[PDB]
């Protein structure tokens, strides 16, 4: 249909870099669409920042801080999306489930 997000997490954006000049902060949700991420605001209706895993340079989950380094081809551009989870479990739970989905794309992409 369209909004068939495989997994969905609820995090709280953090004012680090990209969430300061563009005003991207508050309570969002990391919806993993097995290929495209969707930062939806809990107090909204339509997706807020529909990004893609192919543009995310990398994603770190330091205990509770789950930031996502983004590079070119990013809906916002070069920068980083830091955020906070419930503790050191929701971060290690969303990083392991998101690492498998992304690994299925680059691994199931194509040889060459």
């Amino acid at each position: 249909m369209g909004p068939a997000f495989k997994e969905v997490w609820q995090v709280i954006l953090k004012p680090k870099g990209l969430g300061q000049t563009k005003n991207l902060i508050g309570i969002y949700r990391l919806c993993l669409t097995s290929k495209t991420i969707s930062f939806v605001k809990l107090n909204s209706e339509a997706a807020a920042v529909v990004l893609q895993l192919m543009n995310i340079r990398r994603c770190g989950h330091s205990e509770n801080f789950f930031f996502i380094e983004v590079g070119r081809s990013a809906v916002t551009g070069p920068g980083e999306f830091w955020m906070q989870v419930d503790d050191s479990v929701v971060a290690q739970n969303m990083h392991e489930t998101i690492l498998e989905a992304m690994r299925a794309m680059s691994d199931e992409f194509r040889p060459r």
């Binding site: 290929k35 895993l53 192919m54 543009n55 995310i56 340079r57 990398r58 994603c59 770190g60 989950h61 330091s62 205990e63 380094e69 590079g71 971060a91 290690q92 990083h95 690492l99 992304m102 690994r103 794309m105 680059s106 691994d107 992409f109």
Partner: peptide
Amino acid sequence: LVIAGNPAYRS
């Protein structure tokens, strides 16, 4: 600083 990487990023 637990960090990870993005495999589908290509680069």
